[PDB]
mmCIF file of C-alpha atoms in Angstrom:
data_model
loop_
_atom_site.group_PDB
_atom_site.id
_atom_site.type_symbol
_atom_site.label_atom_id
_atom_site.label_comp_id
_atom_site.label_asym_id
_atom_site.label_seq_id
_atom_site.Cartn_x
_atom_site.Cartn_y
_atom_site.Cartn_z
ATOM 1 C CA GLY A 1 0.000 0.000 0.000
ATOM 2 C CA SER A 2 0.919 3.658 0.319
ATOM 3 C CA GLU A 3 0.794 6.427 2.896
ATOM 4 C CA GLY A 4 -1.444 9.391 2.166
ATOM 5 C CA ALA A 5 -4.782 10.585 3.492
ATOM 6 C CA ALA A 6 -6.507 13.726 2.275
ATOM 7 C CA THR A 7 -3.940 15.481 0.116
ATOM 8 C CA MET A 8 -5.953 17.764 -2.132
ATOM 9 C CA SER A 9 -7.492 16.068 -5.147
ATOM 10 C CA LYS A 10 -7.928 12.312 -5.276
ATOM 11 C CA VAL A 11 -10.112 9.893 -7.201
ATOM 12 C CA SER A 12 -11.482 6.603 -5.928
ATOM 13 C CA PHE A 13 -12.486 3.705 -8.146
ATOM 14 C CA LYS A 14 -14.929 0.853 -7.680
ATOM 15 C CA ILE A 15 -13.938 -2.229 -9.641
ATOM 16 C CA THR A 16 -15.427 -5.666 -9.095
ATOM 17 C CA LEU A 17 -13.809 -8.957 -10.035
ATOM 18 C CA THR A 18 -16.074 -10.450 -12.675
ATOM 19 C CA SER A 19 -14.279 -13.766 -12.353
ATOM 20 C CA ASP A 20 -15.729 -15.072 -9.111
ATOM 21 C CA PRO A 21 -19.417 -15.752 -8.435
ATOM 22 C CA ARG A 22 -19.038 -13.438 -5.464
ATOM 23 C CA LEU A 23 -18.078 -10.425 -7.544
ATOM 24 C CA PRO A 24 -15.866 -8.850 -4.872
ATOM 25 C CA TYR A 25 -15.291 -5.110 -4.874
ATOM 26 C CA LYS A 26 -12.646 -2.772 -3.507
ATOM 27 C CA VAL A 27 -12.532 1.001 -3.228
ATOM 28 C CA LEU A 28 -9.146 2.364 -4.226
ATOM 29 C CA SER A 29 -7.800 5.825 -3.496
ATOM 30 C CA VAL A 30 -5.095 7.574 -5.483
ATOM 31 C CA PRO A 31 -4.188 11.044 -6.767
ATOM 32 C CA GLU A 32 -5.830 11.722 -10.108
ATOM 33 C CA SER A 33 -2.441 12.976 -11.235
ATOM 34 C CA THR A 34 -1.551 9.297 -11.274
ATOM 35 C CA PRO A 35 -2.239 7.353 -14.478
ATOM 36 C CA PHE A 36 -5.289 5.113 -14.395
ATOM 37 C CA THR A 37 -2.963 2.535 -15.902
ATOM 38 C CA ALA A 38 -1.471 2.026 -12.461
ATOM 39 C CA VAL A 39 -4.915 1.442 -11.003
ATOM 40 C CA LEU A 40 -4.864 -1.729 -13.068
ATOM 41 C CA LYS A 41 -1.692 -3.216 -11.633
ATOM 42 C CA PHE A 42 -3.047 -2.289 -8.222
ATOM 43 C CA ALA A 43 -6.566 -3.513 -8.893
ATOM 44 C CA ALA A 44 -4.793 -6.628 -10.107
ATOM 45 C CA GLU A 45 -2.430 -7.460 -7.270
ATOM 46 C CA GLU A 46 -5.325 -6.473 -5.040
ATOM 47 C CA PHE A 47 -7.228 -9.476 -6.338
ATOM 48 C CA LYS A 48 -4.044 -11.516 -6.487
ATOM 49 C CA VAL A 49 -4.292 -11.526 -10.264
ATOM 50 C CA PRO A 50 -1.601 -11.201 -12.941
ATOM 51 C CA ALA A 51 -1.153 -7.688 -14.279
ATOM 52 C CA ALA A 52 -0.490 -9.096 -17.729
ATOM 53 C CA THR A 53 -3.711 -10.678 -18.935
ATOM 54 C CA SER A 54 -5.921 -8.122 -17.229
ATOM 55 C CA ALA A 55 -7.323 -4.733 -18.166
ATOM 56 C CA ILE A 56 -10.002 -2.303 -17.052
ATOM 57 C CA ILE A 57 -12.877 -1.474 -19.371
ATOM 58 C CA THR A 58 -16.022 0.630 -19.264
ATOM 59 C CA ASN A 59 -19.641 -0.468 -19.113
ATOM 60 C CA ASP A 60 -19.761 -0.382 -22.895
ATOM 61 C CA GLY A 61 -17.174 -3.048 -23.623
ATOM 62 C CA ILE A 62 -14.854 -0.188 -24.498
ATOM 63 C CA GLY A 63 -11.251 -0.108 -23.341
ATOM 64 C CA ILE A 64 -9.523 2.798 -21.639
ATOM 65 C CA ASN A 65 -6.554 4.945 -22.588
ATOM 66 C CA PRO A 66 -4.452 6.115 -19.634
ATOM 67 C CA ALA A 67 -3.268 9.054 -21.704
ATOM 68 C CA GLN A 68 -4.286 11.340 -18.865
ATOM 69 C CA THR A 69 -4.610 11.630 -15.105
ATOM 70 C CA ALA A 70 -6.763 8.986 -13.462
ATOM 71 C CA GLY A 71 -9.083 11.826 -12.526
ATOM 72 C CA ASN A 72 -9.402 12.446 -16.246
ATOM 73 C CA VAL A 73 -9.742 8.748 -16.977
ATOM 74 C CA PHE A 74 -12.163 7.862 -14.205
ATOM 75 C CA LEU A 75 -14.130 10.939 -15.197
ATOM 76 C CA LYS A 76 -14.209 10.476 -18.953
ATOM 77 C CA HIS A 77 -14.736 6.755 -18.504
ATOM 78 C CA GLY A 78 -16.254 6.802 -15.038
ATOM 79 C CA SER A 79 -15.714 5.256 -11.625
ATOM 80 C CA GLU A 80 -17.912 2.192 -11.947
ATOM 81 C CA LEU A 81 -15.884 -0.123 -14.151
ATOM 82 C CA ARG A 82 -15.127 -3.816 -14.477
ATOM 83 C CA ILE A 83 -11.869 -5.722 -14.771
ATOM 84 C CA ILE A 84 -11.799 -8.084 -17.728
ATOM 85 C CA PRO A 85 -9.095 -10.459 -18.979
ATOM 86 C CA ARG A 86 -6.893 -9.353 -21.852
ATOM 87 C CA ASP A 87 -5.145 -11.401 -24.511
ATOM 88 C CA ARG A 88 -2.999 -10.293 -27.426
ATOM 89 C CA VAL A 89 -2.480 -13.635 -29.125
ATOM 90 C CA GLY A 90 -3.276 -17.188 -28.089
ATOM 91 C CA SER A 91 -5.274 -18.009 -24.982
ATOM 92 C CA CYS A 92 -7.731 -20.064 -26.998
#
């Protein structure tokens, strides 16, 4: 984890693991300034999942581009998102 409570401008995310029949959730807290791309790795390790075949998407089956601050990603995309598995080639 990290140390930081109430800094100035943060953005929390609510992602649920759509892999288990329990659909567990976890509220994360990080500075928007940070890239939403990191939220993945975190949201991953958080669920003890590999940050290789995983990615966060919207509620429209559309991916996300961490080409901006999380606050700009979680805003443009939203907070309520789902973590889905990713695969470049193979998997089958």
